[PDB]
Scaffold this active site. Structure first.
Site, mmCIF file in Angstrom:
data_model
loop_
_atom_site.group_PDB
_atom_site.id
_atom_site.type_symbol
_atom_site.label_atom_id
_atom_site.label_comp_id
_atom_site.label_asym_id
_atom_site.label_seq_id
_atom_site.Cartn_x
_atom_site.Cartn_y
_atom_site.Cartn_z
ATOM 1 C CD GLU A 6 -52.649 4.476 39.475
ATOM 2 O OE1 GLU A 6 -51.771 5.373 39.373
ATOM 3 O OE2 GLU A 6 -52.881 3.759 40.528
ATOM 4 C CG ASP A 78 -53.950 6.202 43.443
ATOM 5 O OD1 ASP A 78 -53.025 7.039 43.279
ATOM 6 O OD2 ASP A 78 -55.097 6.302 42.967
ATOM 7 C CG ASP A 80 -56.696 1.630 46.705
ATOM 8 O OD1 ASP A 80 -55.826 1.450 45.843
ATOM 9 O OD2 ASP A 80 -57.911 1.765 46.423
ATOM 10 C CD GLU A 82 -58.734 -0.157 41.856
ATOM 11 O OE1 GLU A 82 -58.756 1.027 42.243
ATOM 12 O OE2 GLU A 82 -59.533 -0.592 41.007
ATOM 13 C CE1 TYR A 282 -55.831 6.972 46.478
ATOM 14 C CE2 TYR A 282 -55.584 5.763 48.507
ATOM 15 C CZ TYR A 282 -55.918 5.802 47.196
ATOM 16 O OH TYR A 282 -56.322 4.598 46.681
ATOM 17 N NE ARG A 284 -60.771 4.477 45.500
ATOM 18 C CZ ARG A 284 -60.796 3.523 44.575
ATOM 19 N NH1 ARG A 284 -59.974 2.482 44.606
ATOM 20 N NH2 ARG A 284 -61.645 3.617 43.582
ATOM 21 C CG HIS A 314 -54.285 3.889 54.932
ATOM 22 N ND1 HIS A 314 -53.377 2.897 55.245
ATOM 23 C CD2 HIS A 314 -54.825 3.544 53.736
ATOM 24 C CE1 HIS A 314 -53.388 1.984 54.289
ATOM 25 N NE2 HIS A 314 -54.260 2.348 53.362
#
Length: 581
Positions: A6, A78, A80, A82, A282, A284, A314
């Site tokens: 992104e 990433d 997550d 999203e 990361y 988040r 995570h």
């Protein structure tokens, strides 16, 4: 071989790692989204979402399609939910959904990325559906209520139930403060040999004058009790999102949004001229978990710098390279970046070190007449452990006295005090509360707070958050007409539900159908109200004022004086149907 990310910053870092082996392409953000104008969800076909290419992103789309025809197109968004949805969009437009083409990582380092590109996986549709269900819920709430809120209060509830539940926390705190009745009492302390003890009472008390005179006259005490025990203190956990935001607020003064912006820079990588290099994992995450690799590097650093006696999907927020010390990092980092990095580094290193060890002496002193007792504690440090890094000051000292020994001189301090209400939230402490109650997630703590401040629903004054006139009024409307649906309890329950959707332990459609039943039963699209609250404000004629709302916004009025205008972001709380300015 093509890698898609992104951001231009992530592209640079990955390109620094992989060189000419791969072509790396940045989409410059999202390519596909729900209709910008239209509702974009078919309630007649089990909440079917409608997607359109974002205006301005068509060239990007066409290039993605081209690349996917030219070679394997790996997707390195990433990790997550999203990011998973971004990956799903790319796969769908390219007709590559189901291929092992999605790369997973918690850090953008040579070691991890080189391994990650050789081990791509299929896109995780569970994660995708969790995300799409969040988007749909927010769209149902937003498009239903924002017109009703525009019509009545010139306002809106975009960031859905999480925004409204967080606003409610602030209003709830404000009412607790409003309703608090302080009590006068005395703080009574005795001081001797660098030690202090407090008067032993069942509850706070305002002592009468003759009693105070008696207590102030004390110049000698007897040790009644002394108990010595070993006390260990555990190191802090490695950071997760909520704790980073809290500590960076309280230790550095960073708003939660600033912390997330800096942290993104350090995760994505910064341009140096040893290339484009990453500093942290990361940002988040709900996890304080540390990889075996990271644990081992930390042992090695600790062993070498401090000694081996200091050694304790995570992941925690931690440095990518512990040997990149804060001092080293300043050649590369700006002042704010270096502060956050340093904070993260110390937290992580400390988390891997031994508990500290102290001897705690708990003591009781009495007067010789047996009328009064005073209690205290003192610590003696045995081993600093993690405290060599996570700097900690404690109440240390010495208690050489034994049970039955008299202590003289003693000095008594009596201080009139008044009980205090709970403090207001700061950005950091509001994030603490959202996490505590299951409201919001790593992706949404900071943006929720920023949104409430930006809309004027809450206001910051000397770091503290206050509800406002428009915040209070909108919240009151939502509570009156959508009681259960906007509760903190129902919002947290939905978040838990989306997490089970993510894990494959509940179905998105069941969650959505159940929410929509609840919502649609109460939702009234034509609701037209007249803002009209009694207030705590009085006119000079004597009459109380009432709060109204017109074309020029909110104003105060009474049945004899003139009308005072009021700004939307003047501080206000509603309690029992009355607005307190």
């Amino acid at each position: 071989k093509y890698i898609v990310v992104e951001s231009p910053a992530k592209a640079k870092t990955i390109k620094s790692i992989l060189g000419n082996e791969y072509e790396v392409f940045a989409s410059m953000g999202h390519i596909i989204d729900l209709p910008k104008s239209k509702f974009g969800v078919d309630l007649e076909k089990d909440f079917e979402p409608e997607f359109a290419v974002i205006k301005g992103k068509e060239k990007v789309v066409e290039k993605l399609k081209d690349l996917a025809k030219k070679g394997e197109l790996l997707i390195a968004s990433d990790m997550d939910r999203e990011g998973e949805a971004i990956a799903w969009h790319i796969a769908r437009v390219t007709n590559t959904l189901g291929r092992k083409n999605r790369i997973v990582f918690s850090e953008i380092t040579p070691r991890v990325i080189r391994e990650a590109v050789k081990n791509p996986r299929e896109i995780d549709m569970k994660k995708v559906r969790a995300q799409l269900a969040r988007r749909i819920l927010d769209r149902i709430v937003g498009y239903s209520l924002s017109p009703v809120l525009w019509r009545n209060f010139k306002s809106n509830l975009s960031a859905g139930r999480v925004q409204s539940a967080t606003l409610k926390l602030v209003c709830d705190r404000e009412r607790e403060i409003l309703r608090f009745v302080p009590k006068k009492y005395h703080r009574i302390t005795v001081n001797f040999d660098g030690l202090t003890a407090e008067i032993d009472v069942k509850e706070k008390k305002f002592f009468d004058a003759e009693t105070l005179k008696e207590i102030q006259s004390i110049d000698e005490l007897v040790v009644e009790e002394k108990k010595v025990s070993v006390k260990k203190f555990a190191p802090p956990e490695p950071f997760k999102t909520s704790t980073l935001q809290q500590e960076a607020y309280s230790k550095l003064g960073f708003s939660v949004s600033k912390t997330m912006m800096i942290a993104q820079q350090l995760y994505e990588g910064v341009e140096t001229k040893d290339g484009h290099i990453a500093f942290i994992t990361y940002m988040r995450t709900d996890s304080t978990r540390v990889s075996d690799y990271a644990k081992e590097e930390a042992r090695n650093l600790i062993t070498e710098v401090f000694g081996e006696e200091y050694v304790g999907a995570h992941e925690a927020i931690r440095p990518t390279n512990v040997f990149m010390t804060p001092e080293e990092a300043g050649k590369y980092l700006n002042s704010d970046q270096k502060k956050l990095y340093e904070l993260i580094w110390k937290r992580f290193l400390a988390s891997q070190m031994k508990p500290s060890q102290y001897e705690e002496t708990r003591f009781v002193l009495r007067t010789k007449d047996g009328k009064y007792r005073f209690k205290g504690t003192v610590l003696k440090k045995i081993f600093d452990g993690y405290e060599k890094v996570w700097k900690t000051e404690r109440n240390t000292g010495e208690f050489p006295f034994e049970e039955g020994e008299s202590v003289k001189p003693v000095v008594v301090k009596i201080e009139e005090q008044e009980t205090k209400p709970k403090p207001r939230y700061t950005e950091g402490s509001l994030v603490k509360e959202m996490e505590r109650l299951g409201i919001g997630r790593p992706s949404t703590y900071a943006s929720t707070i920023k949104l409430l401040l930006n809309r004027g629903y809450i206001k910051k004054i000397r770091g503290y958050l206050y509800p406002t006139i428009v915040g209070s009024v909108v919240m009151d409307y939502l509570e009156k007409k959508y009681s259960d649906v906007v509760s903190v309890s129902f919002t947290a329950e939905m978040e838990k539900d989306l997490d089970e959707v993510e894990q494959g332990k509940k179905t998105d459609k069941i969650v959505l159908r159940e929410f929509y039943e609840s919502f649609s039963s109460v939702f009234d699209r034509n609701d037209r109200i007249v803002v009209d609250f009694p207030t705590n404000q009085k006119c000079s004629c004597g009459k109380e004022m009432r709060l109204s709302f017109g074309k020029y916004g909110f104003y105060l009025k009474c049945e004899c004086g003139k009308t005072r205008s009021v700004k939307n972001d003047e501080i206000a709380v509603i309690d029992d149907g009355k607005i307190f300015l």
